Write a protein that binds this ligand. Structure first.
Ligand code: 8XW
Ligand code: ZN
Ligand code: ZN
Length: 230
C-alpha cells in the first residue's frame, strides 16, 4: 500500500495519507545510474499547507504542487528543507515561482550555496546547536547534530505523533549506507540518540527514502552506520 520505487515513474509524485492532516509525498529520481524513491511531508496548517522538503528536482516538485492541488486543494504557503542536498532543496525555485515562502537553517542555506544548489529564501533561527528545537506552525523542527549531513534537521508533528527523520533515518530493509559524502559517521549514532530521547512517544517514523516504520528505524539506522564504521 505504501508506494514503492518501481511503481512511480520519474516525474510523477504520489501522496500518502499518514494521519488526519498529515501526508507523505513520494517521488523518484536518478542518482549515479540508479533511480531511488524519496519522501517528504505535507502538514495541514489551518487553511494552508506546510511542505517539508521538495520532491527532488524542479520537474518532480512541479508535479508535487499539481498533485497537491488536485487531491487536497489547499495552497502550500511555506516549505522547509531539512538539508542542503538536491533531494531536499532541488525545486525550491519552482516553489518560489508558485508563491511558496521557502525556509531552511542558516547552515543549510550556506551549504546549498557552496554546493551550487537552490537556496531557500528565509533563515530558520534557533537551530544552530545540537539539541535545539523550535516550533514552526504545526510542527517542531529539531537539530539532532551531524549525521547524514552536518545540517540535517528532523521534523515532529505533535498532533499525529509523526516523526520525519529525513536522510538521517534509514528504512528498515536498508542495510547499506547510501551517499555518506557529507556524513559524520562518528557523530551519527549520537545524533540518533538525541532524536530517540526527544521523541520517545513517536508512533510513526518516516525515513528519507522508503517505507515508514516506528522507533525501531532509529536503532536500525545506528546499526547500519556503525557497521559501515566497523
Ligand atoms: C539521502 C541520501 O542517502 S543522499 C541524497 C542523494 C541521493 C541519495 C540516494 C541514495 C540512496 C541509496 C540507496 C537507497 C535509497 C537512497 P542527492 O545528493 O542526489 O539528493
Ligand atoms: Zn543528502
Ligand atoms: Zn536523501
Amino acid at each position: 500500500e505504501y508506494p514503492t520505487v518501481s511503481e512511480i515513474p520519474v516525474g510523477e509524485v504520489r501522496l500518502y495519507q499518514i494521519a488526519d492532516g498529515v501526508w507523505s509525498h513520494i517521488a523518484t529520481q536518478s542518482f549515479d545510474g540508479a533511480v531511488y524513491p524519496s519522501n517528504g511531508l505535507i502538514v495541514r496548517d489551518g487553511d494552508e499547507l506546510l511542505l517539508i522538503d521538495t520532491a527532488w528536482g524542479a520537474k518532480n516538485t512541479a508535479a508535487l504542487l499539481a498533485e497537491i492541488e488536485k487531491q487536497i486543494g489547499l495552497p502550500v504557503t511555506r516549505a522547509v528543507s531539512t538539508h542542503f542536498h538536491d533531494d531536499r532543496v532541488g525545486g525550491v525555485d519552482v516553489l518560489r515561482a508558485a508563491g511558496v515562502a521557502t525556509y531552511a537553517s542558516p547552515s543549510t542555506r550556506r551549504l546549498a550555496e557552496v554546493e551550487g544548489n537552490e537556496i531557500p529564501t528565509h533563515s530558520l533561527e534557533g537551530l544552530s546547536s545540537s539539541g535545539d528545537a523550535v516550533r514552526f506552525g504545526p510542527v517542531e523542527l529539531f537539530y539532532p547534530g551531524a549525521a547524514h549531513s552536518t545540517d540535517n534537521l528532523v521534523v515532529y508533528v505533535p498532533s499525529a505523533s509523526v516523526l520525519y527523520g529525513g536522510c538521517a533515518i534509514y528504512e528498515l530493509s536498508r542495510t547499506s549506507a547510501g551517499n555518506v559524502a557529507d556524513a559524520d559517521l562518528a557523530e551519527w549514532p549520537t545524533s540518533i540518540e538525541r532524536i530517540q530521547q526527544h521523541y520517545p512517544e513517536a508512533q510513526f517514523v518516516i525515513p528519507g527514502h522508503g517505507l515508514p516504520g516506528g522507533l525501531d528505524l532509529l536503532k536500525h539506522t545506528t546499526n547500519v552506520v556503525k557497521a559501515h564504521t566497523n
